[PDB]
Amino acid sequence: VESFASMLRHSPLTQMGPAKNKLVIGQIFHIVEDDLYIDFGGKFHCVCKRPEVDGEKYQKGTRVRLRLLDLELTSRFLGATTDTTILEADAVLLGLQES
Amino acid sequence: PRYELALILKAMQRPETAAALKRTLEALMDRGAVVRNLENLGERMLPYKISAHNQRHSRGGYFLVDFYAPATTVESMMEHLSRDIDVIRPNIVKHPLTQEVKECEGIVPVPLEEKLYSTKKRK
Amino acid sequence: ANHLKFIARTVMVQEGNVEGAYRTLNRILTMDGLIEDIKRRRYYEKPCRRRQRESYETCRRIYNMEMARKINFLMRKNRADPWQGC
Amino acid sequence: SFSIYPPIPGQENSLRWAGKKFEEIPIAHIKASYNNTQIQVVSAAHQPLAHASCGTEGFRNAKKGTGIAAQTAGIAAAAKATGKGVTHVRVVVKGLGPGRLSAIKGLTMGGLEVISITDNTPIPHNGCRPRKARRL
Amino acid sequence: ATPSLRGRLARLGNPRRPILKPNKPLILANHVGERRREKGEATCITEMSVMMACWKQNEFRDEACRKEIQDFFDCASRAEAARKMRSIQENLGELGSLPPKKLNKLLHRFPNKPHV
RNA sequence: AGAGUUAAAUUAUAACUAAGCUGUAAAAAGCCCUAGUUAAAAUAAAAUAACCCACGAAAGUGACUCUAAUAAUCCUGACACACGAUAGCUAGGACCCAAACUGGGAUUAGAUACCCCACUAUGCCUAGCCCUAAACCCAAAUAGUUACAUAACAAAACUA
Ligand SMILES: [Mg+2]
Ligand SMILES: [Mg+2]
Ligand SMILES: [Mg+2]
Ligand SMILES: [Mg+2]
Ligand SMILES: [Mg+2]
Ligand SMILES: [Mg+2]
Ligand SMILES: [Mg+2]
Ligand SMILES: [Mg+2]
Ligand SMILES: [Mg+2]
Ligand SMILES: [Mg+2]
Ligand SMILES: [Mg+2]
Ligand SMILES: [Mg+2]
Ligand SMILES: [Mg+2]
Ligand SMILES: [Mg+2]
Ligand SMILES: [Mg+2]
Ligand SMILES: [Mg+2]
Ligand SMILES: [Mg+2]
Ligand SMILES: [Mg+2]
Ligand SMILES: [Mg+2]
Ligand SMILES: [Mg+2]
Ligand SMILES: [Mg+2]
Ligand SMILES: [Mg+2]
Ligand SMILES: [Mg+2]
Ligand SMILES: [Mg+2]
Ligand SMILES: [Mg+2]
Ligand SMILES: [Mg+2]
Ligand SMILES: [Mg+2]
Ligand SMILES: [Mg+2]
Ligand SMILES: [Mg+2]
Ligand SMILES: [Mg+2]
Ligand SMILES: [Mg+2]
Ligand SMILES: [Mg+2]
Ligand SMILES: [Mg+2]
Ligand SMILES: [Mg+2]
Ligand SMILES: [Mg+2]
């Protein structure tokens, strides 16, 4: 049997460490016209805008390259008890699942 | 070095200049001062025009005198400098190099302040 | 008055358009806070009545700063919504 | 890098208007007070060539406040000045009042050519105390 | 950056003495301030003045100067159409931000929490 | 707390120049020994920095420089001791500007007010008093805890 702590210690999400400027692989599970909703698998999906190069190449099911900025978007604001969640993470688009 | 003397002097020719400096450091060495160094910063056109000894000056020579002196003294030298006919403005500052450099470790980031207002379910 | 003249607060109009250059100078003074100071200093304002100003200004600046930030943070989610009419 | 505004008093800058140095170009003092405006156009040599006031232009106690009046004074001022043959003017506005802009425009529209605006408005570094505020 | 609120407010803990005395509690509100309607100036004043001078010199014969007059009406039409255009212009907003309706919905979607 | 110093502005007072200048919602009175410009001491007050939050027991303290200098191996404590904003009082200086009072001018039914214009005690220094404030952060000092817990509102609740 594996102890949970072990599963944690050896996971990729742990191995990655700090979120900033990480190079990640992600997948497009939903599309609105300019906006592509990308699960890179972390917790929350990020959002992207379809680039000018090869517009029609990015579709639902497509895989993508991401530069992960922040694992999720949050801050505390004036006179707030708890901080405020966007329920998304911040990422940038590089290229599409360059293979 | 302990004290620093910013001499703004009436712009003259070389001999007269030499005279002025010489007698200045003489006065200091008489009040008990140990002179380290003399730094001529040039003759500049002053940032603004300075009126002293019934003469309104545009330009001036700039000098820096580092020296050690006893506490009691500084007043005396200031007086004898103010009296002087060719000093276009005197001053004496604690020499910059006594003041320590305490390392900026950097910016200690200030977090938003919480628990200002009570928790109230208002509206 | 002891300083050399015409170096301070001086714009020189380019391509002969005056109105533009005046707008420019105005933007200078108002950027540095001099207009608010002239206007402040037409009459007097007593020390107490001044700290009140200061504090109201600074509170208000804090509020507007924060609210600005919050707005520009929630900006993303202005995007047209995916899940509509679920 | 074109038109850096503040030309230095050193001679490193050669730019001529009517073949004159920037030091030699006429200074038009504009004074904009809440109830008044007055322009005085003076030589680089400080010999007054033109004077126009909102009152000297025949407006009266209130109405002389307005920007209308300002441009009005500006025109005739630049008339008197043009009479003595000044092409170009570096302007300085003193005070902050209604007829700032209006009068400056008034010099141009009045056929007088403007190079520079500089604002000398007295700004106390906390010298003399102002008169008390009003309602109280 | 936002001005430090640490030690500013009068509170039981604080060893310092007060800096800010807020009139209204410092909390981000949910809604946002409604747009501020801008006021007008006197329109056309220039051409008005020029045409005045003209009649003064010309003893008020309107036939003597067509130019000042036609330019005057040019300004009047520019003014009226500027008013019509600033009436339909309400899509203006901030020109690069969003109208205060949008901000207010959006702000109700991620409200600020005082309580709990 | 001393001692020394002045950048901006302002004022005397001259040189020119124009007849106005000031002043409000609008005016009037007021001043033309006025106004703009160019010069320029004293006195007074210390833009920006400060979106900082330091120093003092508090009052208070933010132009510059130097001298002196910020009690207590640190619990509480008076009717005792020493201080204590402004205003005020006594004597002597200072007087740019402000300004109770007062005199003009408007406004008004009236206007002993709000607006305008002058000008004074007074703000300034040196020495001596007076000892009051919404002297309020209306929240005592010194150690603690975030357990228990919402009269209301405000700056959340409590031990010793
Ligand atoms: Mg609340
Ligand atoms: Mg001068
Ligand atoms: Mg400020
Ligand atoms: Mg100040
Ligand atoms: Mg009262
Ligand atoms: Mg303290
Ligand atoms: Mg206090
Ligand atoms: Mg309140
Ligand atoms: Mg003393
Ligand atoms: Mg001076
Ligand atoms: Mg003067
Ligand atoms: Mg004067
Ligand atoms: Mg008015
Ligand atoms: Mg009269
Ligand atoms: Mg400030
Ligand atoms: Mg403070
Ligand atoms: Mg101590
Ligand atoms: Mg004790
Ligand atoms: Mg007292
Ligand atoms: Mg007193
Ligand atoms: Mg007096
Ligand atoms: Mg005097
Ligand atoms: Mg007076
Ligand atoms: Mg009366
Ligand atoms: Mg009545
Ligand atoms: Mg009223
Ligand atoms: Mg007087
Ligand atoms: Mg005092
Ligand atoms: Mg107090
Ligand atoms: Mg209070
Ligand atoms: Mg009490
Ligand atoms: Mg006690
Ligand atoms: Mg104690
Ligand atoms: Mg407890
Ligand atoms: Mg209730």
Coordinates of N, CA, C and O in Angstrom, one line a residue, chain B residues 57-109:
Chain B
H57 N 27.2 88.2 -6.2 CA 28.0 87.4 -7.1 C 27.3 86.4 -7.9 O 26.3 85.8 -7.5
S58 N 27.8 86.2 -9.1 CA 27.3 85.3 -10.1 C 28.0 83.9 -10.0 O 27.5 82.9 -9.8
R59 N 29.4 84.0 -10.2 CA 30.2 82.8 -10.2 C 30.9 82.7 -8.8 O 30.8 83.6 -7.9
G60 N 31.7 81.6 -8.6 CA 32.4 81.4 -7.4 C 33.3 80.2 -7.5 O 33.1 79.3 -8.4
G61 N 34.4 80.1 -6.7 CA 35.2 78.9 -6.6 C 34.7 78.0 -5.5 O 34.1 78.6 -4.5
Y62 N 34.9 76.7 -5.6 CA 34.3 75.8 -4.6 C 35.5 74.9 -4.0 O 36.3 74.4 -4.7
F63 N 35.4 74.8 -2.7 CA 36.5 74.1 -2.0 C 36.0 73.3 -0.9 O 34.9 73.5 -0.3
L64 N 36.7 72.2 -0.5 CA 36.3 71.3 0.5 C 37.5 71.0 1.5 O 38.5 70.5 1.1
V65 N 37.3 71.3 2.7 CA 38.3 71.2 3.7 C 37.9 70.1 4.7 O 37.1 70.4 5.6
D66 N 38.6 69.0 4.7 CA 38.3 68.0 5.8 C 39.3 68.2 6.9 O 40.5 68.5 6.7
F67 N 38.8 68.2 8.1 CA 39.7 68.4 9.3 C 39.1 67.9 10.6 O 37.9 67.7 10.7
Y68 N 40.0 67.6 11.6 CA 39.5 67.3 12.9 C 39.6 68.5 13.7 O 40.5 69.3 13.7
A69 N 38.6 68.7 14.6 CA 38.5 69.8 15.5 C 37.8 69.5 16.7 O 36.9 68.6 16.7
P70 N 38.1 70.1 17.8 CA 37.4 69.9 19.1 C 36.0 70.6 19.1 O 35.9 71.6 18.5
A71 N 35.1 70.0 19.8 CA 33.7 70.4 19.8 C 33.5 71.9 20.0 O 32.8 72.5 19.3
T72 N 34.1 72.4 21.1 CA 34.0 73.8 21.5 C 34.3 74.7 20.4 O 33.8 75.9 20.4
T73 N 35.1 74.3 19.4 CA 35.7 75.2 18.5 C 34.8 75.7 17.3 O 34.9 76.9 17.0
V74 N 34.0 74.9 16.8 CA 33.3 75.1 15.5 C 32.7 76.5 15.4 O 32.8 77.1 14.3
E75 N 32.1 77.0 16.4 CA 31.6 78.3 16.5 C 32.6 79.4 16.1 O 32.4 80.2 15.2
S76 N 33.8 79.3 16.7 CA 34.9 80.2 16.5 C 35.2 80.4 15.1 O 35.3 81.5 14.5
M77 N 35.4 79.2 14.4 CA 35.8 79.2 13.0 C 34.7 79.7 12.1 O 35.0 80.4 11.2
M78 N 33.5 79.4 12.5 CA 32.3 79.9 11.8 C 32.3 81.5 11.8 O 32.1 82.1 10.8
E79 N 32.6 82.0 13.0 CA 32.6 83.5 13.2 C 33.7 84.1 12.3 O 33.5 85.1 11.6
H80 N 34.9 83.5 12.4 CA 36.0 84.1 11.7 C 35.9 83.9 10.2 O 36.5 84.7 9.4
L81 N 35.0 83.0 9.8 CA 34.7 82.8 8.3 C 33.7 83.8 7.9 O 33.8 84.3 6.7
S82 N 32.7 84.1 8.7 CA 31.7 85.1 8.4 C 32.2 86.5 8.3 O 31.8 87.3 7.5
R83 N 33.2 86.7 9.2 CA 33.9 88.0 9.2 C 34.6 88.3 7.9 O 34.6 89.4 7.4
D84 N 35.2 87.2 7.3 CA 36.1 87.3 6.2 C 35.4 88.0 5.0 O 34.3 87.8 4.7
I85 N 36.2 88.8 4.3 CA 35.7 89.7 3.2 C 35.6 88.9 1.9 O 34.7 89.3 1.1
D86 N 36.4 87.9 1.6 CA 36.3 87.1 0.4 C 35.5 85.8 0.4 O 35.4 85.1 -0.6
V87 N 35.0 85.4 1.6 CA 34.2 84.1 1.6 C 32.8 84.4 1.1 O 32.1 85.3 1.7
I88 N 32.4 83.8 0.1 CA 31.1 84.1 -0.5 C 30.0 83.2 0.0 O 28.8 83.5 -0.1
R89 N 30.3 82.1 0.7 CA 29.5 81.5 1.7 C 30.2 80.3 2.3 O 30.7 79.4 1.6
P90 N 30.3 80.3 3.6 CA 30.9 79.2 4.5 C 29.9 78.1 4.8 O 28.7 78.4 4.9
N91 N 30.4 76.9 5.1 CA 29.7 76.0 6.0 C 30.5 74.9 6.5 O 31.5 74.5 5.9
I92 N 30.1 74.3 7.6 CA 30.8 73.2 8.2 C 29.8 72.1 8.6 O 28.8 72.3 9.3
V93 N 30.0 70.9 8.0 CA 29.2 69.8 8.1 C 30.0 68.6 8.7 O 31.2 68.5 8.5
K94 N 29.3 67.8 9.6 CA 30.0 66.6 10.0 C 30.3 65.8 8.8 O 29.5 65.5 7.9
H95 N 31.6 65.4 8.6 CA 32.1 64.8 7.4 C 31.3 63.5 7.1 O 31.1 62.7 8.0
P96 N 30.8 63.4 5.9 CA 29.9 62.4 5.4 C 30.4 61.0 5.8 O 29.5 60.1 5.9
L97 N 31.7 60.8 6.0 CA 32.2 59.4 6.2 C 32.3 59.0 7.7 O 32.8 57.9 8.0
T98 N 31.7 59.8 8.6 CA 31.4 59.3 9.9 C 30.1 58.5 9.9 O 30.0 57.5 10.6
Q99 N 29.1 58.9 9.1 CA 27.8 58.3 9.0 C 27.9 56.9 8.4 O 28.6 56.7 7.4
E100 N 27.3 55.9 9.1 CA 27.5 54.5 8.7 C 26.5 54.1 7.6 O 25.5 54.7 7.4
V101 N 26.9 53.0 6.8 CA 26.0 52.4 5.9 C 25.4 51.1 6.5 O 26.1 50.1 6.6
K102 N 24.1 51.2 6.9 CA 23.4 50.1 7.4 C 22.6 49.4 6.3 O 21.7 50.1 5.7
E103 N 23.0 48.2 6.0 CA 22.5 47.6 4.7 C 21.0 47.6 4.5 O 20.3 47.0 5.3
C104 N 20.5 48.3 3.4 CA 19.2 48.1 3.0 C 19.2 46.7 2.7 O 20.0 46.2 1.9
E105 N 18.4 45.9 3.4 CA 18.3 44.5 3.1 C 17.5 44.4 1.8 O 17.6 43.4 1.0
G106 N 16.6 45.4 1.7 CA 15.8 45.5 0.5 C 14.5 46.0 1.0 O 14.4 46.6 2.1
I107 N 13.5 45.9 0.1 CA 12.1 46.3 0.5 C 11.5 45.2 1.3 O 11.4 44.0 0.9
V108 N 11.1 45.5 2.5 CA 10.3 44.6 3.3 C 8.9 44.9 2.9 O 8.3 46.0 3.2
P109 N 8.2 44.0 2.2 CA 6.9 44.2 1.5 C 5.9 44.4 2.6 O 5.8 43.6 3.5

